[PDB]
Amino acid sequence: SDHDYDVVIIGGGPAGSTMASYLAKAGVKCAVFEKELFEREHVGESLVPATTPVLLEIGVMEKIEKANFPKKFGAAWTSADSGPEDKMGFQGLDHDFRSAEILFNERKQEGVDRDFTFHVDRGKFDRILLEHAGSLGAKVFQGVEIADVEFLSPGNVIVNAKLGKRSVEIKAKMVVDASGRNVLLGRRLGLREKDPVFNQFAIHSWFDNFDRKSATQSPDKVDYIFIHFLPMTNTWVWQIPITETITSVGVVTQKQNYTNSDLTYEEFFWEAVKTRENLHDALKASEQVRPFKKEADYSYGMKEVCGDSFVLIGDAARFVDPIFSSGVSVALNSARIASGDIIEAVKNNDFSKSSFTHYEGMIRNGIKNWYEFITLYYRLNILFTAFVQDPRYRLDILQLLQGDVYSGKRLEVLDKMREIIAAVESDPEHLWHKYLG
Amino acid sequence: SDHDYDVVIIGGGPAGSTMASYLAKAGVKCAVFEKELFEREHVGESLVPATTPVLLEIGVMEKIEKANFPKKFGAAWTSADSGPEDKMGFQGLDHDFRSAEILFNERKQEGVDRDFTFHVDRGKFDRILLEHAGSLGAKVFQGVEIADVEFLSPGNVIVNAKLGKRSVEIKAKMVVDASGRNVLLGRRLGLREKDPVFNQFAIHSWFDNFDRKSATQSPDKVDYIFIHFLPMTNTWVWQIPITETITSVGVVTQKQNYTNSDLTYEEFFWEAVKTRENLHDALKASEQVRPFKKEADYSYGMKEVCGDSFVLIGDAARFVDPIFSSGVSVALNSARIASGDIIEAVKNNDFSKSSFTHYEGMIRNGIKNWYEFITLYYRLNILFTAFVQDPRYRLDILQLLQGDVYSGKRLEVLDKMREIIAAVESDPEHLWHKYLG
Numbered sequence: 001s002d003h004d005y006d007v008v009i010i011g012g013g014p015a016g017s018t019m020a021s022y023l024a025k026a027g028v029k030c031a032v033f034e035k036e037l038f039e040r041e042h043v044g045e046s047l048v049p050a051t052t053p054v055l056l057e058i059g060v061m062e063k064i065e066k067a068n069f070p071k072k073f074g075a076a077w078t079s080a081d082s083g084p085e086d087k088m089g090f091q092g093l094d095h096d097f098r099s100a101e102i103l104f105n106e107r108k109q110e111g112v113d114r115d116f117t118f119h120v121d122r123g124k125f126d127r128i129l130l131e132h133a134g135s136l137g138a139k140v141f142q143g144v145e146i147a148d149v150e151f152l153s154p155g156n157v158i159v160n161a162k163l164g165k166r167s168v169e170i171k172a173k174m175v176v177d178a179s180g181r182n183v184l185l186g187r188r189l190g191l192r193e194k195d196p197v198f199n200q201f202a203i204h205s206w207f208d209n210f211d212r213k214s215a216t217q218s219p220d221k222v223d224y225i226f227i228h229f230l231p232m233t234n235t236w237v238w239q240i241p242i243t244e245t246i247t248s249v250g251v252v253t254q255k256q257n258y259t260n261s262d263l264t265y266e267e268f269f270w271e272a273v274k275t276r277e278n279l280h281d282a283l284k285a286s287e288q289v290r291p292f293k294k295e296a297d298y299s300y301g302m303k304e305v306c307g308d309s310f311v312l313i314g315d316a317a318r319f320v321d322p323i324f325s326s327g328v329s330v331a332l333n334s335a336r337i338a339s340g341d342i343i344e345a346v347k348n349n350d351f352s353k354s355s356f357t358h359y360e361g362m363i364r365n366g367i368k369n370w371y372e373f374i375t376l377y378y379r380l381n382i383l384f385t386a387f388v389q390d391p392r393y394r395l396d397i398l399q400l401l402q403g404d405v406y407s408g409k410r411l412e413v414l415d416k417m418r419e420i421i422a423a424v425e426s427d428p429e430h431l432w433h434k435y436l437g
Numbered sequence: 438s439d440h441d442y443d444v445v446i447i448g449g450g451p452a453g454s455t456m457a458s459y460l461a462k463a464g465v466k467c468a469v470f471e472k473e474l475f476e477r478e479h480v481g482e483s484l485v486p487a488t489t490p491v492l493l494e495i496g497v498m499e500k501i502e503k504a505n506f507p508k509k510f511g512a513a514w515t516s517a518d519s520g521p522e523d524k525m526g527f528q529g530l531d532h533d534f535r536s537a538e539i540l541f542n543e544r545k546q547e548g549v550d551r552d553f554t555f556h557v558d559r560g561k562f563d564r565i566l567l568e569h570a571g572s573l574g575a576k577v578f579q580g581v582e583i584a585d586v587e588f589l590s591p592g593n594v595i596v597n598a599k600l601g602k603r604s605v606e607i608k609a610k611m612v613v614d615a616s617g618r619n620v621l622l623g624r625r626l627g628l629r630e631k632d633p634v635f636n637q638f639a640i641h642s643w644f645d646n647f648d649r650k651s652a653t654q655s656p657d658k659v660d661y662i663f664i665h666f667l668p669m670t671n672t673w674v675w676q677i678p679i680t681e682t683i684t685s686v687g688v689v690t691q692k693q694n695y696t697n698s699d700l701t702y703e704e705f706f707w708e709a710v711k712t713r714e715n716l717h718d719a720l721k722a723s724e725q726v727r728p729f730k731k732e733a734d735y736s737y738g739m740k741e742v743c744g745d746s747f748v749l750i751g752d753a754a755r756f757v758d759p760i761f762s763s764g765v766s767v768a769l770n771s772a773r774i775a776s777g778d779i780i781e782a783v784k785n786n787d788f789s790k791s792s793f794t795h796y797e798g799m800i801r802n803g804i805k806n807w808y809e810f811i812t813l814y815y816r817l818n819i820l821f822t823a824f825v826q827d828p829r830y831r832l833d834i835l836q837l838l839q840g841d842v843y844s845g846k847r848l849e850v851l852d853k854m855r856e857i858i859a860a861v862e863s864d865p866e867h868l869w870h871k872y873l874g
């Protein structure tokens with residue numbers, strides 16, 4: 001019916017590759033346009049187990065397993081500052097806000113058939129996923145950037161694909177914005193809404209032969225994600241395995257802390273890192289295999305995540321902050337849910353907003369909990385570990401850390417978090433008070 | 438000067454990736470068009486050391502070393518039929534045509550700084566090379582097939598690039614045909630000349646946990662290329678390491694032997710392989726990780742390997758037969774030499790045949806020796822091992838097996854081979870006679 005494709009995916013990352021796999025697997029004729037030549041370096045390494053049902057559902061899990069990514073059986077938090085001595089009657093703290101751990105297997109998660117998910121080289125990871133989408137029948141273009149999308153009619157779109165400085169017109173019944181922090185349709189259509197509260201900022205690189213025992217004694221916990229709290233305001237470091245020897249390490253903080261630093265990005269990394277001697281010395285002993293990258297300006301909302309002949313997924317739709325290592329999960333799950341709506345949209349031949357309403361509701365609520373949970377971490381700071389460790393909140397907290405964010409249940413935790421916040425907020429005498437953020 | 442690129446490379450294999458690396462490294466604005474999404478399966482695994490000077494010269498060697506390809510320190514030939522007992526005064530045969538070996542380090546090769554080259558997964562190999570070409574500045578398109586090249590004027594060409602069924606016009610001062618056995622410009626311009634003498638044919642796949650000690654006792658020789666002669670006319674099997682566990686195994690023979698077999702490709706493999714019990718049982722014990730592939734119709738010449746605003750390289754220019762595992766070497770060296778001419782062609786702004794004359798002469802002579810050497814192997818059959826093992830011819834033979842085929846020296850070996858051929862040819866009494874092909 002003079003359309004080149006039913007669907008045209010913009011961007012070939014996790015959000016794009018997955019959407020393409022869900023469509024080609026369901027018989028829909030789609031295409032992915034990736035502007036970069038893969039493999040391409042990308043921050044965002046530590047997966048969360050809500051990825052695996054999707055990875056399984058699309059048929060790519062064993063190809064991913066053959067990549068031999070370091071397994072992520074769980075997640076840790078450490079702080080040089082053990083907290084207040086009182087502990088406000090919190091049932092279990094084995095080290096007084098100093099250390100906290102959690103195994104992903106401690107809660108059963110529908111779809112998960114595993115004790116572990118992966119920490120990935122995001123270059124390798126994304127190639128394998130796009131290759132896979134390719135192998136399922138999806139047409140994939142690399143080195144071909146999408147300049148703009150012409151919105152002619154409901155169920156009728158043209159896409160401006162460029163090859164350097166040479167345009168090509170691609171007719172489609174719709175587009176999928178699976179762009180990154182780039183955000184093609186959010187900028188073009190003016191949907192992008194920069195976050196008012198969040199002004200966080202990240203600096204990271206890779207570190208070879210980085211002794212992961214710098215973070216813990218036990219060899220069972222060596223390949224967990226470690227989130228090292230730093231004494232600076234709203235500051236923490238990630239430690240993520242990439243290979244057996246290579247670790248990815250990034251500081252995250254308020255830009256206000258960096259810009260007042262009067263330092264280059266490299267120097268700020270070491271200076272913030274030097275506030276925790278074990279981390280610093282392990283990093284100094286290890287080998288930088290990559291120059292330091294900045295990641296900034298990444299906290300943004302989106303006025304509309306769907307429309308007539310368009311839907312936004314993954315980072316093209318939203319990003320908050322990388323604490324809980326959940327963004328790739330959202331990429332795959334926003335790609336899963338929006339595909340369910342798209343597969344029916346081509347069947348019904350009905351690409352107006354109404355056909356994508358189920359995705360809109362599902363994602364917005366999935367962003368809400370994800371968003372709220374990130375805010376309350378920064379509000380609690382090191383006091384977050386009291387909730388992680390306490391049985392009354394532990395597996396309710398694990399639910400979120402696992403990425404089970406889509407269901408429409410409230411998640412009573414997030415109010416119980418809010419109450420104990422408000423109890424301390426109110427009272428500046430409160431012993432927990434100076435540890436807040 | 439309203440050209441999108443100085444050069445447009447057709448195809449993103451070893452020949453294409455390399456050309457692109459040589460051009461981008463020398464400041465020339467080029468582009469590679471690969472029709473497939475990488476990684477993509479490709480036969481042609483065992484490299485020959487004439488690749489390494491090029492791999493080094495383009496700056497990709499360490500990226501290749503990080504791929505951890507099995508090292509190829511040398512090459513072996515085995516036959517269940519030990520030959521005639523006479524040995525016609527050949528100075529050294531340690532097993533009577535039964536076994537022969539050679540180490541690549543036994544002759545010094547200019548550019549080689551190594552005792553070994555690699556056996557590669559050609560999927561991985563080609564991605565790393567095209568990525569590399571990318572990183573040097575070359576623009577790379579994947580999923581974009583080149584339909585045809587319009588030859589307007591010397592130094593002025595248009596290329597028809599398609600995206601499914603959607604054309605795009607790309608202006609260029611010239612094109613490089615780095616296509617495969619596909620052969621775009623050879624078919625379009627009618628340069629393709631199917632080989633009259635060679636009608637060889639190959640069937641192969643991968644085999645996991647394939648005990649490489651089936652071929653030899655010693656653990657030093659376990660990862661050599663092994664060429665197992667079979668009793669059938671012009672028949673031999675390759676054994677090439679791909680990983681620590683995976684081996685690539687292919688039978689090569691006259692199609693006449695297959696077509697008279699009355700068997701499917703799978704069945705012929707096992708039947709020809711069963712003529713050598715150690716090989717068969719090691720293969721039967723191992724795990725097929727891939728279905729069997731046919732490779733046929735690959736012996737072809739080319740009327741013209743260069744022209745006004747065009748040059749053919751690698752398999753787009755020629756292929757003979759895969760005995761000496763030398764085709765990827767030709768891909769890289771034809772890409773090296775033709776780049777030397779192209780780099781000057783853009784400098785001089787002169788893209789007529791005359792500017793590529795140095796490549797034409799160099800390749801044609803490099804094909805000649807490569808071609809002759811392949812013919813005399815098939816003529817000698819198992820008697821080839823007498824030349825491999827004898828000091829008088831050993832390192833002169835190694836020169837060819839190493840891929841030092843470009844120089845314009847005659848290579849006295851190939852006549853000395855021819856004489857001893859003609860001595861046996863003439864006389865059907867001759868003891869060596871029934872072992873010829």
Ligand SMILES: Cc1cc2nc3c(=O)[nH]c(=O)nc-3n(C[C@H](O)[C@H](O)[C@H](O)COP(=O)(O)OP(=O)(O)OC[C@H]3O[C@@H](n4cnc5c(N)ncnc54)[C@H](O)[C@@H]3O)c2cc1C
Nearest residue numbers: 011013014015035044046146180202314315322325327328
């Ligand atoms: C500092 C930091 C740390 C993080 N840490 C983690 C972590 O530990 N764990 C985790 O799960 N997540 C993490 N994230 C989030 C994660 O990186 C993203 O959520 C994830 O990459 C989203 O995938 P995506 O496909 O939606 O977007 P991307 O992965 O960014 O993919 C977008 C793709 O679209 C392409 N593209 C863009 N524009 C165009 C165009 N016009 N035409 C064609 N192609 C285009 C891009 O080249 C890119 O390949 C982190 C983020 C930051 C900033």
Ligand SMILES: Cc1cc2nc3c(=O)[nH]c(=O)nc-3n(C[C@H](O)[C@H](O)[C@H](O)COP(=O)(O)OP(=O)(O)OC[C@H]3O[C@@H](n4cnc5c(N)ncnc54)[C@H](O)[C@@H]3O)c2cc1C
Nearest residue numbers: 448450451452472481483583617639751752759762764765
């Ligand atoms: C049975 C067999 C065994 C072999 N064994 C060996 C061995 O052991 N060792 C060895 O060194 N060599 C071997 N070879 C030879 C080797 O495979 C080739 O010589 C080598 O692949 C040549 O590289 P190339 O880039 O010139 O062509 P290719 O590697 O074939 O690359 C060509 C590329 O161009 C692309 N292309 C084609 N048409 C178009 C178009 N219109 N637009 C855009 N892109 C296009 C293709 O998709 C492909 O990616 C063997 C060959 C055969 C048949």
Ligand SMILES: [Cl-]
Nearest residue numbers: 080276277278
């Ligand atoms: Cl410490």
Ligand SMILES: [Cl-]
Nearest residue numbers: 322325326327
């Ligand atoms: Cl995240």
Ligand SMILES: [Cl-]
Nearest residue numbers: 517713714715
């Ligand atoms: Cl045998």
Ligand SMILES: [Cl-]
Nearest residue numbers: 759762763764
């Ligand atoms: Cl070859």
